[PDB]
Amino acid sequence: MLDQQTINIIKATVPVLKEHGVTITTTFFKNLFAKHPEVRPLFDMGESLEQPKALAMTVLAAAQNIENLPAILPAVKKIAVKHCQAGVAAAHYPIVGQELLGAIKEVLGDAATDDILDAWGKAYGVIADVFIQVEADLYAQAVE
Amino acid sequence: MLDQQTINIIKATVPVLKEHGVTITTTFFKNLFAKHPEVRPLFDMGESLEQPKALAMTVLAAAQNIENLPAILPAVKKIAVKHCQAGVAAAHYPIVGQELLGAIKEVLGDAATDDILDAWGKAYGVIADVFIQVEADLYAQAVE
Numbered sequence A, B: 001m002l003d004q005q006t007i008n009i010i011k012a013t014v015p016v017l018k019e020h021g022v023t024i025t026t027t028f029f030k031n032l033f034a035k036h037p038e039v040r041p042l043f044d045m046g047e048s049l050e051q052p053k054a055l056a057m058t059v060l061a062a063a064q065n066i067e068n069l070p071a072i073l074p075a076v077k078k079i080a081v082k083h084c085q086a087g088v089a090a091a092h093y094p095i096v097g098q099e100l101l102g103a104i105k106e107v108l109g110d111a112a113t114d115d116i117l118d119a120w121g122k123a124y125g126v127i128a129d130v131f132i133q134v135e136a137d138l139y140a141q142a143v144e
C-alpha cells in the first residue's frame, strides 16, 4: 500500500498529466513499440499497427481513483478479459510501466522531481497488481 | 488507504484471532442479533434463525490478504451476489464492524490495546468498502 505523500502527489499531479493527455499517449506508444518489438504482435488485429488509445489515460483514471479502486472494477474486469484474450503476461506490466513513466517524465519536464516520478512508479505498480491478479484468476478460470 | 504500522498490526494479530475463531464467530453473532433486532429478518430462511458461520472468519481472511485484496475478489463477488439478494445496505456495514470489534476485544482481553482495536477498525473499513462498492455496482446492474 501507498503512503499518504505518495497519494498526495498522485492526486495533485494527475490533472496535469490528464491536461497533457495527447502527449502522454503518443509518447507512450511510440516508445513502447520502438523499444519493445516483442510486444508488437499483441497489438496486431485483422492495416497498420493498431492502438488502444485509452491505455495510458485509463492508468491515470485508475490513479485518480487510487483510494477507491473497487469503484473502477467493472472497467478493470472488461479490460482484463481483453488482456487475457490477447495474451498479456504479468512480465509485460513492468515494460508498460517503464514507458508510461518515460512519458510522464516528458510531460512534467522541469517539474519532474525524483519523488514525484517515484510516486507514479509506486502508483502504477499498485494499479498493475490489480490487473495482474484479476487476469491470473481469469486465466485459471479458463481451464476449470 | 492503511498506513504501514496499521498493516503490520493486522498481519501480526490476525493469526491470534484465527486461533480463537470459534469465540469470535459466536460472540459476533450473539451480539449482532441481540443488539440489532432490525437485521434479524435478513438471516431468515424458509426453522431456527440462520447463520453464515464463515462471516467473521472471512473478514479475518480478507485482513490476512490486506496487501493483495484483489486476490480475494472471486470470493467477494460471490458473497456480494448473496448480499444483494438478501438486501444488505451500506449502512449495515458499520453495525457488523461494531460487533466484530466487540468480539475481537473479547478474545484479546488483556492484549486489546487501543491501537490494536483502532487498527482492526480501519482494516474492517477498507474491507467493507470493497463489498459496499461491488454491491452498489451489482444493485445498479440489476436495473440496467
Ligand code: HEM
Pocket: A039, A042, A043, A045, A052, A054, A055, A056, A058, A059, A062, A079, A082, A083, A086, A088, A089, A092, A093, A094, A096, A127, A128, A131
Ligand atoms: C497496467 C495497466 C494497463 C491498463 C490500465 C490498460 C488499459 C487498456 C485499455 C483501456 C485497453 C482498451 C480496452 C478496450 O476498450 O477494449 C487495453 C487494451 C490492450 N492492452 Fe492494456 N492496459 C494496461 C496494461 C497492459 C499491458 C502490460 C499490456 C502488455 C502488452 C497491454 C496490452 C494491451 C493489448 C494488446 C490491448 C488490445 C486488446 C485488443 O485489441 O482487443 N496492456 N488496455
Ligand code: HEM
Pocket: B039, B042, B043, B052, B054, B055, B056, B058, B059, B062, B079, B082, B083, B086, B088, B089, B092, B093, B094, B096, B127, B128, B131
Ligand atoms: C466485510 C464484511 C462482510 C463479510 C466478509 C461477509 C461475509 C459473508 C459470508 C462468507 C457469507 C456466506 C456466503 C456463502 O457462503 O453463501 C455471508 C452471508 C450473509 N451476510 Fe455477509 N459479510 C459481511 C458483511 C455483512 C453485512 C454488513 C451484513 C448486513 C446484515 C451481512 C449480512 C449477510 C446475510 C444476511 C448473509 C446470508 C446470505 C444468504 O443467506 O444467502 N453481511 N456474509
